[PDB]
Design a protein around this ligand. Structure first.
Ligand SMILES: *[C@@H]1O[C@H](CO)[C@@H](O[C@@H]2O[C@H](CO)[C@@H](O[C@@H]3O[C@H](CO)[C@@H](O[C@@H]4O[C@H](CO)[C@@H](O[C@H]5O[C@H](CO)[C@@H](O[C@@H]6O[C@H](CO)[C@@H](O)[C@H](O)[C@@H]6O)[C@H](O)[C@@H]5O)[C@H](O)[C@@H]4O)[C@H](O)[C@@H]3O)[C@H](O)[C@H]2NC(C)=O)[C@H](O)[C@H]1NC(C)=O
Ligand SMILES: *[C@@H]1O[C@H](CO)[C@@H](O[C@@H]2O[C@H](CO)[C@@H](O[C@H]3O[C@H](CO[C@H]4O[C@H](CO)[C@@H](O)[C@H](O)[C@@H]4O)[C@@H](O[C@@H]4O[C@H](CO)[C@@H](O)[C@H](O)[C@@H]4O)[C@H](O)[C@@H]3O)[C@H](O)[C@H]2NC(C)=O)[C@H](O)[C@H]1NC(C)=O
Ligand SMILES: *[C@@H]1O[C@H](CO)[C@@H](O[C@@H]2O[C@H](CO)[C@@H](O)[C@H](O)[C@H]2NC(C)=O)[C@H](O)[C@H]1NC(C)=O
Ligand SMILES: OC[C@H]1O[C@H](O)[C@H](O)[C@@H](O)[C@@H]1O
Ligand SMILES: [Fe+3]
Ligand SMILES: [Zn+2]
Ligand SMILES: [Zn+2]
Length: 341
């Protein structure tokens, strides 16, 4: 009945889950997979219960029957009275970021540049930006637009993996899990910060979180915001402060998914679990925090205040919204009702 097998992607996430599992008295247990796609398979098979997922993977998962349960919620300034759990989710701002010194570089001079993506099939990293780029260009040749990239999940032998580093040993080049140096929001941003790339497709929170002494991490301590710039679709360039008026799209929050025959029970264990290890949780600061991993967004983005109830008991199409659901479907014409397993 009341035991949840969570699916960790990669070895860094397995160690946070094991610790979570240590402190939960087996209320949560951990399966492990190499890539998000594999984890979705494990949950389909019933060998794992649930996992937190970027909107891009939620669309894959959805075609395969999986259902969103709870969603991540960050610090908000509208909806002050409402408790985090009952508070509506705001989404997040996909942005294209560049280095200020890289003068001249505009959304209209991206062709043949170098790019940093979070991973293939994710929202801010891949689907919005590449979606705009296929539309604007009239061609599915997205593999020929940037000269070199790090798009974790693309063919290791391809130009789309050229700029990825792999792990400390140089192994696992381009793998779509935290072992890649330039995987996910932080890695894609680092990718630009180290001047490995000309542009990084991350979200707004990422720039702020890793700049102005916020990360303390070796590669990020000396980073200042004012050395960065966003690329608007109006061909302009703005400071990281004008995010609301210079973004590519608003992205539906990452959410936990499960099989629907389990959602009721996944939902219950987790609400309890967060009362214990969440932002103001009984045993967070002292013993263990579910929502902290030191700029590494492991299992959950470090900016999650809490996971929140959904309300409108929404399906996956409704959760992602008809706007975004069309964006992906158009883009998948390039690579029409499926379940890719
Ligand atoms: C892109 O992503 C960035 C990073 O994620 C994000 O920046 C982050 O924003 C959040 C909030 O959205 C910041 O957190 C906040 O920081 C402050 C200061 O350290 C914290 O302290 C205060 O918290 C108060 C309690 O919530 C807050 O009250 C708020 O509510 C009151 C009343 O409801 C209201 O206050 C107003 O004050 C007026 C002046 O006297 C007064 O006349 C008026 O009547 C009014 O009541 C405001 O609504 C207020 O927001 C205080 O205002 C303080 O904020 C606070 O708890 C919270 O922790 C993050 O620090 C920040 N990240 C970084 C790295 O700085 C960007 O904003 C994102 N960009 C976009 C476009 O979304
Ligand atoms: C890449 O490029 C493709 C090709 O253009 C693009 O796909 C297209 O996206 C469009 C926008 O997302 C789609 O148009 C949509 O809007 C209409 C209108 O409905 C909306 O407007 C009304 C009034 O303003 C609102 O009240 C309503 O809430 C909607 O927001 C949609 O169809 C409408 O449906 C309503 C139902 O209430 C009817 O009453 C209307 O008469 C009308 O039929 C439509 O379903 C779209 O959501 C367009 O459909 C879509 N084209 C194709 C072939 O799929 C991608 O979005 C681009 N991608 C990226 C990344 O930009
Ligand atoms: C594992 O989960 C169970 C279910 O919530 C917890 O046992 C309940 O905990 C609450 C709070 O202590 C009690 O009020 C209930 O009486 C307990 N029993 C039930 C309802 O079965 C337990 O606390 C969790 N264990 C850990 C270590 O997190
Ligand atoms: O406008 C963006 C919105 O898109 C979707 O409906 C999401 O479910 C919601 O979190 C987000 O606020
Ligand atoms: Fe995302
Ligand atoms: Zn907008
Ligand atoms: Zn509905």
């Amino acid at each position: 009945y009341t035991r949840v097998v969570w699916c960790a992607v990669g070895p860094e996430e397995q160690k946070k889950c094991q610790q979570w599992s240590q402190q939960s008295g087996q209320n949560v247990t951990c399966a492990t997979a190499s890539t998000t796609d594999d984890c979705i398979v494990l949950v389909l098979k019933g060998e794992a219960d649930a996992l937190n997922l970027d909107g891009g993977y939620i669309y894959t998962a959805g075609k395969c029957g999986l259902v969103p349960v709870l969603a991540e919620n960050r610090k908000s300034s509208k909806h002050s009275s409402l408790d985090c759990v009952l508070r509506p989710t705001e989404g997040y701002l996909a942005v294209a970021v560049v280095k200020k010194a890289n003068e001249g570089l505009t959304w209209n001079s991206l062709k043949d540049k170098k790019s940093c993506h979070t991973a293939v099939d994710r929202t801010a990293g891949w689907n919005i930006p590449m979606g705009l780029i296929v539309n604007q260009t009239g061609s599915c040749a997205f593999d020929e637009f940037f000269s070199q990239s790090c798009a974790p999940g693309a063919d290791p032998k391809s130009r789309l993996c050229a700029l990825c580093a792999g792990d400390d040993q140089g192994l696992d080049k381009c793998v779509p899990n935290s072992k890649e140096k330039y995987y996910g929001y932080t890695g894609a941003f680092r990718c630009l910060a180290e001047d490995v790339g000309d542009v990084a497709f991350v979200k707004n929170d990422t720039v702020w979180e890793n700049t102005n002494g916020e990360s303390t991490a070796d590669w990020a301590k000396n980073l200042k915001r004012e050395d960065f710039r966003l690329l608007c679709l109006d061909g302009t360039r703005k400071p990281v402060t004008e995010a609301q008026s210079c973004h590519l799209a608003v992205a539906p929050n990452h959410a936990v998914v499960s099989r629907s025959d389990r959602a009721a029970h996944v939902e219950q264990v987790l609400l309890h679990q967060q009362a214990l290890f969440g932002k103001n949780g009984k045993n967070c600061p002292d013993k263990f925090c579910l929502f902290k991993s030191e700029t590494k967004n492991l299992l959950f983005n470090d900016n999650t205040e809490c996971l929140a109830k959904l309300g409108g008991r929404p399906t996956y199409e409704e959760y992602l919204g008809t706007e975004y659901v069309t964006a992906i479907a158009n883009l998948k014409k390039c690579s029409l009702e499926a379940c890719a397993f």
